[PDB]
Write a protein that binds this ligand. Structure first.
Ligand SMILES: Nc1ncnc2c1ncn2[C@@H]1O[C@H](COP(=O)(O)OP(=O)(O)OP(=O)(O)O)[C@@H](O)[C@H]1O
Ligand SMILES: Nc1ncnc2c1ncn2[C@@H]1O[C@H](COP(=O)(O)OP(=O)(O)OP(=O)(O)O)[C@@H](O)[C@H]1O
Ligand SMILES: [Mg+2]
Ligand SMILES: [Mg+2]
Lengths: 360, 360
């Protein structure tokens, strides 16, 4: 007569329990190697050998209870066998795992990915990019931030009238203007998580897409990259229905219904990005599926001035005006990425980038 | 009650442990044959019979502590069973393996390859090609060397402003000018390692590409050969999205996001090479993905003079000028490979190659 808690692979606290188990690896006869390396120079690579508990029946001594944990071997199922019928040590283990895991993810953003029909973490948590480090047009980031915050902070007004509690944004522009960087900065600012989804995968179908959109982690953003490339449209639409033009078991109607249909879930934010706004079917970007669409374009006077004052802090304000005037006179259209590269050429050299502005 | 260290196939020190195990092959009842052969002449091939320890349970007598090693058998795993609970002998074994392995790789370059979704070594370490042995245009190798060194030696400046710590270079030119040779010479000079990646493989997908680009070995270079051949573009781009045109499950957007997106890693250098600069999509070679693009072309006066003074050391300087003048007068465009071949015809024969210069 014991208690045999079973936690299979498909659990939200799976990573939390794994992290706690790596924390409590002491007094474990079976082990797995946990060595990492950090090269410095001269062929002297630092060694960091440690001990991940192997998928075995290691006996743990938490609170003096001789708790037995077994991880099997691609189907995985972790087991926490104990004595008697208490269930309190389970509460304590889950709480300690939560305290340890959330401590690790502090000041960072967690990136998930679509594995099969489920979300799994993708590498270590990444350092968040400061929002002010990305410079957009005047009064553009503020509008998006305010709209997202207003959507988050007003759930009651949605339910009191019956509108589904959903939202979606679309960003389009020339390549190299700040779409992905702004998305990353916004995710860092809002303390959310990014879920990467590809519409051209070979293991995606309508039912799997619906399940993925239904089981997305809470306090997270869903990102769709290059929606245009997954469906040729427009000129085709005038003759025949929208074909797939990709590798996968997906259809246009399935995606349209999954984004906003009858079975769509609630409290979800979706971001989509494209480079050709004119290649998207009108039914896909109608209100209800894409509430706000914004255009990010080439550089301007204020954007160039802000970028200059950001890359060379402490300089006089006249230098930024000189740089902006010279850049806008020498060339008409220019991308922020090219400006960033040109600045990267002249590292810590103000008044040097204000002379060699020949980048035609 | 023992300690059972488990090191599976997917480990960095796997090769180090294998090399140490081949070093400590003494006192091993089970063996595998280690014969190598070196032909000289007259059907007399020198034998080098030795003993690789077979994948068995050989008992080792390191430090007088009876250690029971075991390699199983696709799926491969190595086990180091010991006595008691000490963990010191594991540290000593790892340190000795590091000392032995790094001793072997001295003055050479290690070439990795993409097996499945992991990097594995490809043959014995190769002898490094001296940097000066590759002659490029005046002030071209120095610029690239300085830029790479500056990127390596300034990680703080990247972090203090938020730019991702990444870089990428592109080399393009006519076939037979020194792209791959210069890449090899630079890798030898910088004491890095080369990782070969093919975009046309049949076992490559977006997730696998991202995982490979994330787990690349430290102090290494990532090489992409003939990026143009993996994606037809330009004239197609004016009508329809970029097709893949190959054998494999890869997409243009997937490669674009993997090279520089949201989930891209840090501290990575990527080299790409092509022969048709006009067949590359503009979005692929924008700044942020290709920080520096350089053109290697046909021979010039200084290049020919340096090549002549390199292939025939000790000759008077007037002979180099005579050879350069005659070559540039008899022909307008010529590749360094053709000059190397023409010199190879006249081995150790200066003043002979300055007469038979008819290679129209
Ligand atoms: N507005 C901006 N402010 C600062 N840096 C920027 C800006 N736009 C782009 N960059 C920089 O340029 C590089 C590429 O930016 P990013 O990937 O966000 O461009 P993008 O518009 O998403 O391009 P693509 O459409 O090809 O994905 C990064 O180094 C990024 O930091
Ligand atoms: N600049 C050079 N100096 C010395 N040898 C050179 C030079 N360029 C080419 N060679 C020699 O020519 C041969 C081919 O060189 P390499 O493979 O680097 O050319 P490549 O430009 O990479 O050609 P491809 O585009 O076909 O790969 C080698 O023997 C190489 O040593
Ligand atoms: Mg992007
Ligand atoms: Mg080559």
């Amino acid at each position: 007569y014991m208690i045999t808690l079973e936690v299979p692979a498909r659990d939200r606290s799976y990573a939390w329990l794994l992290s706690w188990l790596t924390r409590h690896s002491t007094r474990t006869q079976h082990l797995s190697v946990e060595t990492s390396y950090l090269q410095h120079e001269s062929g002297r690579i630092s060694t960091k050998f440690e001990f991940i508990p192997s998928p075995g029946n290691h006996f743990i001594w938490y609170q003096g209870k001789w708790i037995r944990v077994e991880r099997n071997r691609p189907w995985e199922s972790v087991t926490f066998t104990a004595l008697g019928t208490d269930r309190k040590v389970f509460f304590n283990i889950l709480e300690e795992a939560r305290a340890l895991a959330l401590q690790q993810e502090e000041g960072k953003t967690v990136m998930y990915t679509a594995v099969g029909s489920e979300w799994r973490t993708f590498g270590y948590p990444r350092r968040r990019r400061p929002l002010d480090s990305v410079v957009l047009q005047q009064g553009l980031a503020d509008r998006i931030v305010k709209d997202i915050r207003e959507f988050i902070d007003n759930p009651k007004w949605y339910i009191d009238r019956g509108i589904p509690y959903r939202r979606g944004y679309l960003l389009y522009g020339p390549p190299g203007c700040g779409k992905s960087s702004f998305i990353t900065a916004l995710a860092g600012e809002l303390e959310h998580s990014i879920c990467l989804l590809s519409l051209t995968d070979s293991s995606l179908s309508d039912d799997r897409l619906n399940h993925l959109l239904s089981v997305a982690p809470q306090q997270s953003l869903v990102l769709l990259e290059d929606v245009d490339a997954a469906f040729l449209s427009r000129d085709l639409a005038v003759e025949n229905p929208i074909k797939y033009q990709g590798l996968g078991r997906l259809t246009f109607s399935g995606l349209l219904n999954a984004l906003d249909g009858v079975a769509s879930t609630e409290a979800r934010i979706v971001f989509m990005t494209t480079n050709y706004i004119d290649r998207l079917d009108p039914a896909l970007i109608r209100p209800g599926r894409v509430d706000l669409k914004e255009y990010v374009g080439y550089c301007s006077h204020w954007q160039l001035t802000q970028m200059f004052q950001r890359f060379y802090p402490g300089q006089a304000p006249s230098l930024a005006e000189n740089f902006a005037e010279h850049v806008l006179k020498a060339t008409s259209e220019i991308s922020p990425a090219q400006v960033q590269g040109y600045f990267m050429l002249y590292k810590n050299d103000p008044m040097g980038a204000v002379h060699n502005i020949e980048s035609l």
